[PDB]
Write a protein that binds this ligand. Structure first.
Ligand code: HEM
Ligand code: HEM
Ligand SMILES: C[C@H](O)[C@H](O)[C@H]1CNc2nc(N)[nH]c(=O)c2N1
Ligand SMILES: C[C@H](O)[C@H](O)[C@H]1CNc2nc(N)[nH]c(=O)c2N1
Ligand SMILES: Cc1cc(N)nc(C#CCN2CC(F)(F)C2)c1
Ligand SMILES: Cc1cc(N)nc(C#CCN2CC(F)(F)C2)c1
Ligand SMILES: [Zn+2]
Lengths: 413, 420
């Protein structure tokens, strides 16, 4: 079997064979498509054996040693550990490879042209929340690199019995607090009101401002999580100004330079790494469209349009559209002026298409989630909009997991 | 699966879908692969090839009649059981059957209602249906189409309509409108190698010239109709210009915008699709409504393989066009779409912006889950091609499935037509 995807802007046709090697479901059926569902859908010995064999087989194929003496010894060895300890340990090489291919297989990530330049930080010797904080500070300092951002991931010990998970309770390493006021308004980031509340309850003393970097809430070995303040000199931030509108800086807007997702699960050969924060650099629309202009977020369209004296009486004036562009210009100009790595949605989508074509050529395909790949503004004037894409799930993979406060059984009376 | 929920992530409203349990044919997807962004994911058709056998066409016919009579509070009534026996005899004798007026009107309205990719389906029950099943010649088809265009344009107050020509019989007697839309502009290959007018239509334009059309070779030459009746060679007709409502495109602040010399037509009238009812195939069924501004302002004007006017607009705007991060493309894009909306509204020609339209479709989804238990929607098509996440449908999960009656794509007739 083969499957073809077409680009309707260029008429290039690519041929996907890679999809024959997927195994978990997409959520779709033969008669319903669920491609716009945000979230559709511990292993025993018997379950873990084929998953591990699959990953060891593919690792040894990648390094052109399939069938080798070392491949067969490794399988034997992995299998002893699963027999003995009901789990196994990855070699460093396997860990690095698995982490890179989890990124390579992330169908919703438009930045995957960079997948093989991932700095893997092995933190599987960590045993405490203090330890995790140390590991995470070093990640932040390395990744941030004074504005010249570098891709990086820090991998904490894998799940065991489900009762000793390592977790970063934060959704990202750097995020701003949100506070709901008695009058119903919201200060800061409305997305983070719940996590802000858990922080305050755990003992965080909030300054209660618009851009309070939240504390880290770190859980090691199934214990209660603990609070740590990131050293402020490690949180690189960019004040948002506009190259034309002198008044823009008066909005008091700023954002952090480092996007670092910390709530996902890294799955490699059946092993579950439940704490594995990873970071790259921003595409501008993530800030200027979603973070700033989602109605459920900082929601600054009306403010910005006001200062543009746009006619906000009718929607067909496209005042929101006009204000959205200017905000996103300001984001890109601000990061660039401060020499903090950022990519605009045109460059990023163009690069993703080159990456996708190369992946079809060298690998037999590239799973891609159109719904997520297309930027949230100016969709059809980017090339990915006109690109057909096959979405399927390959492993190693990044996966969502339950928020830890919906699951954690608290220790301290 | 037993019942499927969709959630809106901006409002947290969750809807529960059972209508999908009536899905008939494959989406293209599997448990293991999703084809949500494939333009034509599936070739699963409900009847095969040409004249089907009775065991092939009757079950489809029986299904649609069953659905139609359920819709009107019968099922099992005298009329329902008589109609089955009637279609049964009719297929036994002619290898086809004919729809009652009521069944035709019901079927067209429900094809629109089931069109997962259509953002405008709040209007679905307000559809004027012109029965043209007595047509026999391309001259007849021209008469019917002209009336359609005139009724639907209605001096700018556009009305939704569909005109249904005779169904397919053996596949060698098809009625086809060879135009993809009733009204489009020509596209000319230039001697240097660029393109004048609309590049999408270069091939169809060449067929027209090859058929004897005399191109004015302008940027906005309305194309002739190329009408095929009862399988015969297609015939050219010029739509009377007084029936083709056009809007000159100007900007409410940029006075220089008018001098780009852009216009568009007022009536979007899709004419190359196939309407499928009870196993019957209406290969010629031009339908029309009114534009979402983005269709002209984003896709028609700004696609790289269409009119591609972004750099020329940006130039006039004095934008930094050195680097993509200046977002000059995005900035011109907004201004063009302001211009299109301003122009249509100034000339009292029906048009809807993408904000109003996506909001309407959220309301329509809610209605459909209330009364019907679901609403098939294609997120890739529903979300506007600009300012996606600031329209409410971006944040709305959708379930996509194929309900019948439907509109379907079909081969371009020149790929399949043996000339005479
Ligand atoms: C190097 C620069 C990178 C860029 C420009 C980039 C860009 C993006 C963007 C814009 C999104 C959508 C985010 C959203 O809409 O919320 C995304 C998603 C994602 N990225 Fe990347 N990314 C980068 C690096 C990485 C790295 C280093 C990893 C993992 C090692 C990664 C894994 C993912 C995953 C798993 C998703 C989707 C999350 C999900 O399934 O919900 N990305 N990326
Ligand atoms: C009344 C105003 C209407 C509006 C505002 C509207 C809006 C739209 C838009 C924006 C699209 C996507 C177009 C594209 O990107 O090419 C679309 C697709 C479609 N519309 Fe509607 N529409 C309207 C009326 C109708 C009517 C009357 C019918 C049929 C009787 C219809 C059937 C369809 C179908 C079948 C498609 C998708 C075809 C495909 O699958 O490619 N629409 N609509
Ligand atoms: C590849 C992709 O499916 C294709 O470009 C689609 C995307 N979404 C679309 N949405 C609409 N409304 N119209 C289109 O033509 C398309 N094209
Ligand atoms: C309902 C819909 O699936 C949801 O809003 C998705 C749409 N596409 C997206 N695409 C990206 N990159 N990020 C998102 O959060 C979303 N949200
Ligand atoms: C590594 C990375 C790079 C980037 N440029 N952006 C993101 C992001 C994000 C936040 N959302 C939540 C999610 F679903 F995980 C993606 C992550
Ligand atoms: C009735 C209608 C209304 C509208 N506002 N727009 C369209 C459209 C279109 C053009 N494309 C070709 C297609 F694929 F059929 C859709 C159709
Ligand atoms: Zn799907």
């Amino acid at each position: 079997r083969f499957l073809k995807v077409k680009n309707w802007e260029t008429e290039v046709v690519l041929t996907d064979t890679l999809h024959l090697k997927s195994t978990l479901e997409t959520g779709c059926t033969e008669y319903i498509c669920m491609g716009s569902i945000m979230h559709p859908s511990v292993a025993t010995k018997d379950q873990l054996f084929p998953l591990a064999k699959e990953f060891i087989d593919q690792y040894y194929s990648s390094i052109k040693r399939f069938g080798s003496k070392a491949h067969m010894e490794r399988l034997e060895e992995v299998n002893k550990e699963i027999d003995t300890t009901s789990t196994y340990q990855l070699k460093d090489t396997e860990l690095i490879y698995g982490a890179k291919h989890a990124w390579r297989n992330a169908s919703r990530c438009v930045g995957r042209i960079q997948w093989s330049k991932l700095q893997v930080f092995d933190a599987r010797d960590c045993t405490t929340a203090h330890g995790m904080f140390n590991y995470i500070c070093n990640h932040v300092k390395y990744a941030t690199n004074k504005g010249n951002l570098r891709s990086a991931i820090t991998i904490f010990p894998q799940r065991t019995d489900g009762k000793h998970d390592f977790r970063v309770w934060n959704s990202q390493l750097i995020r701003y607090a949100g506070y709901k006021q008695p009058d119903g308004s919201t200060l800061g980031d409305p997305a983070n009101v719940q996590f802000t509340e858990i922080c305050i309850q755990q003992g965080w003393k909030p300054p209660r401002g618009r851009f309070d970097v939240l504390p880290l809430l770190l859980q090691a070995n199934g214990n209660d999580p603990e609070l740590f303040q990131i050293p402020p000199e490690l949180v690189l931030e960019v004040p948002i100004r506009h190259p034309k509108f002198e008044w823009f800086k008066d909005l008091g807007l700023k954002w952090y330079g480092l996007p670092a997702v910390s709530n996902m699960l890294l799955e490699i050969g059946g092993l579950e790494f439940s704490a594995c924060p990873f970071s790259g650099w921003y595409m501008g629309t993530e800030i200027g469209v979603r973070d700033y202009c989602d109605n459920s977020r900082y929601n600054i369209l009306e403010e910005v349009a006001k200062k543009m004296n746009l006619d906000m009486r009718k929607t067909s004036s496209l005042w929101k559209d006009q204000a959205l562009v200017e905000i996103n210009i300001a984001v890109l100009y601000s990061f660039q002026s401060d020499k903090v790595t950022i990519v605009d949605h045109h460059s990023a989508t163009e690069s993703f298409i080159k990456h996708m074509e190369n992946e079809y050529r060298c690998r037999g395909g590239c799973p891609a989630d159109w719904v997520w790949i297309v930027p949230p503004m100016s969709g059809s004037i980017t090339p990915v909009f006109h690109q057909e894409m096959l979405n399927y799930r390959l492993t190693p993979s990044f996966e969502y997991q339950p928020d830890p406060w919906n699951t954690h059984v608290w220790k301290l009376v």
